[PDB]
Amino acid sequence: MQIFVKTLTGKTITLEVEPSDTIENVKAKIQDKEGIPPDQQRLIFAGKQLEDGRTLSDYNIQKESTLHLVLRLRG
């Protein structure tokens, strides 16, 4: 099933996923596609931060949902 991960600038990268994928696993496919390391990936859905132990199903994430990526870089 496809989902979309949007950056703060409007760019949209697409992943192939299963609802039982963990958030660790999703961040990993973004590192496969875009080289961004997982610990740099703050993912959001519906105003909610996607915690690492959880699945897409845990957040009612469905086919062609769009997630928001904000880079987590230290200050």
Partner: protein
């Protein structure tokens, strides 16, 4: 105070402009901009100036014609642009709008667009292509380097302070040295 000048042109929102200009007068801000609503806010303001991690060409034209960079020789232009990248790096850091583990992503891209723009104007200002690329690697998170913009800011002001001290003294906020 060349910096409050440039923020005046750049930030249309008066509440946010006020925030940025007040922060020039202190070395530490307790107002942070790492929350999601804040990052979208910044994104709304600064996306018209960015093209990913670079300034977009319309912004560049505008900025090079500003009261700040218009009649200057290339080297000064570059030197001036270098300090502005340091200012946004500070703004993004843990002493300003950032935190120990997080920073306003948009301000890092604007700081990067200014540093990259300065290299295009006169790369001699950096003194080494390896330094220019470590600066980019730290702003962007590439090649596993430490991302801390509080650390990056120090590396930039130290270069400015020794390589071009007049420019740095005039174009970098007094409260921040």
């Amino acid at each position: 105070n060349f910096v409050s000048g440039i923020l005046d042109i750049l930030i249309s929102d008066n509440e946010l402009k006020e925030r940025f200009i007040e922060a020039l007068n202190s070395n530490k801000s307790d107002y942070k901009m790492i929350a999601d609503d804040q990052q979208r806010k910044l994104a709304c303001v600064w996306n018209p100036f960015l093209d990913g991690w670079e300034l977009n060409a319309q912004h560049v034209d505008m900025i090079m014609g500003s009261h700040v960079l218009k009649d200057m020789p290339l080297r000064k232009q570059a030197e001036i642009l270098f300090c502005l990248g340091g200012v946004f790096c500070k703004y993004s850091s843990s002493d300003m709008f950032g935190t120990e583990y997080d920073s306003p992503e948009i301000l890092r891209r604007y700081a990067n667009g200014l540093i990259e723009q300065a290299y295009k104007t006169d790369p001699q200002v950096f003194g080494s292509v390896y330094y220019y690329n470590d600066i980019l690697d730290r702003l962007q998170g590439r090649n596993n380097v430490f991302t801390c913009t509080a650390v990056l800011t120090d590396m930039l002001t130290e270069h400015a302070k020794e390589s071009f001290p007049e420019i740095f003294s005039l174009y970098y906020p007094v409260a921040w040295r």
